[PDB]
Curated annotation (Swiss-Prot), chain A:
Location(s), subcellular: Virion
UniProt remark on domains: The N-terminus consists of a long intrinsically disordered tail. The central part contains the coiled-coil multimerization domain (MD or OD). Forms a four-stranded coiled coil structure. The C-terminus constitutes the alpha-helical X domain (XD) that binds to the nucleocapsid (N-RNA complex) and the L polymerase.
Residues with the Phosphothreonine modification: 31, 39, 63, 79
Coiled coil: 1-26
Organism classification: Viruses, Riboviria, Orthornavirae, Negarnaviricota, Haploviricotina
Protein name per its UniProtKB record: Phosphoprotein
UniProt modified residues of type Phosphoserine: 38, 73, 75, 82
Recorded family membership: Belongs to the rubulavirus/avulavirus P protein family.
Region ranges (Multimerization): 1-60
Assembly and interaction partners: Homotetramer. Interacts (via multimerization domain) with polymerase L; this interaction forms the polymerase L-P complex. Interacts (via N-terminus) with N0 (via Ncore); this interaction allows P to chaperon N0 to avoid N polymerization before encapsidation. Interacts (via C-terminus) with N-RNA template; this interaction positions the polymerase on the template for both transcription and replication. Interacts with host RPS6KB1 kinase; this interaction may play a role in the viral replication and transcription.
Residues that span the membrane, as ranges: none
Main function: Essential cofactor of the RNA polymerase L that plays a central role in the transcription and replication by forming the polymerase complex with RNA polymerase L and recruiting L to the genomic N-RNA template for RNA synthesis. Also plays a central role in the encapsidation of nascent RNA chains by forming the encapsidation complex with the nucleocapsid protein N (N-P complex). Acts as a chaperone for newly synthesized free N protein, so-called N0, allowing encapsidation of nascent RNA chains during replication.
UniProtKB/Swiss-Prot annotation, chain C:
Described function: Essential cofactor of the RNA polymerase L that plays a central role in the transcription and replication by forming the polymerase complex with RNA polymerase L and recruiting L to the genomic N-RNA template for RNA synthesis. Also plays a central role in the encapsidation of nascent RNA chains by forming the encapsidation complex with the nucleocapsid protein N (N-P complex). Acts as a chaperone for newly synthesized free N protein, so-called N0, allowing encapsidation of nascent RNA chains during replication.
Assigned protein family: Belongs to the rubulavirus/avulavirus P protein family.
Organism of this sequence: Mumps virus genotype A (strain Jeryl-Lynn) (MuV)
Subcellular localization: Virion
PTM annotation (Phosphoserine): residues: 40
Lineage: Viruses, Riboviria, Orthornavirae, Negarnaviricota, Haploviricotina
Modified residues (Phosphothreonine): 33, 41
Subunit-level organization: Homotetramer. Interacts (via multimerization domain) with polymerase L; this interaction forms the polymerase L-P complex. Interacts (via N-terminus) with N0 (via Ncore); this interaction allows P to chaperon N0 to avoid N polymerization before encapsidation. Interacts (via C-terminus) with N-RNA template; this interaction positions the polymerase on the template for both transcription and replication. Interacts with host RPS6KB1 kinase; this interaction may play a role in the viral replication and transcription.
Gene coding for it: P/V/I
Sections of the chain in a coiled coil: 1-28
UniProt name for this protein: Phosphoprotein
Shown residues in whole-protein numbering: 218 to 271 of 391
Cystine residue pairs: none
Ranges where the record places region Multimerization: 1-54
Domain remark in the UniProt entry: The N-terminus consists of a long intrinsically disordered tail. The central part contains the coiled-coil multimerization domain (MD or OD). Forms a four-stranded coiled coil structure. The C-terminus constitutes the alpha-helical X domain (XD) that binds to the nucleocapsid (N-RNA complex) and the L polymerase.
Length: 85, 69, 54, 50
């Protein structure tokens, strides 16, 4: 029983060793993801900064082009949501 | 006799080594917790960006719109 | 021949310790499965906004 | 005695189960490759905004 008490133990143990070497890659990939997501925070802060202060200007009709030609706008109601939805 | 004791001693030592390996692996999860905490803000800020883009798009006078219901 | 019993109780003790640490490790793995799901949603909405900007 | 050999067969069976789900943990690597791909896309597309 002692042989049995050792041989399978060593075999399982070697399997554990292999799985452990596989698992230590977790820490590495996880910290790389952490840093990359930190860069995502850095760039998302900038994209917020750019989008917060944006100019929206209506060109108007200073040229005096006839309204017939200017009728380049939809005449059908379309239901779009922004936040609530 | 004493050889079986040598074997048991070597196993317990080997399990101790693995035990250090697994407690290190467990300690690795704190920064996973931090990355979850930051993915929180990821979703929040992304939703804010989406909402800003949507309300900018609806602001165009060319296409009449309407809130559902 | 009692030492054998003493060491055996010791192996049981480190054993329980392995059980608890491995169980919480499984909890960490379950929480990374959550993370996976949320970031999936982040990808979906990012794709939506990429469609919207163009 | 034999009781502890039986118990240890029990604990190594549980151990094999732990390794079973451990093998399932690594499945995240493809999706994290996808998340890096997301970074690349968002960088390329925020380049357009400026």
């Amino acid at each position: 029983e002692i042989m049995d008490l050792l041989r399978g133990m060593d075999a399982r143990l070697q399997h554990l060793e292999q799985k452990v070497d596989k698992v230590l890659a977790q820490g590495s990939m996880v910290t790389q993801i952490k840093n990359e997501l930190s860069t995502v925070k850095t760039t998302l802060a900038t994209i917020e900064g750019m989008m917060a202060t944006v100019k929206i200007m209506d060109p108007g009709n200073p040229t005096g082009v006839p309204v017939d030609e200017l009728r380049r706008s939809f005449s059908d109601h379309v239901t779009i949501v922004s936040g609530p939805g």
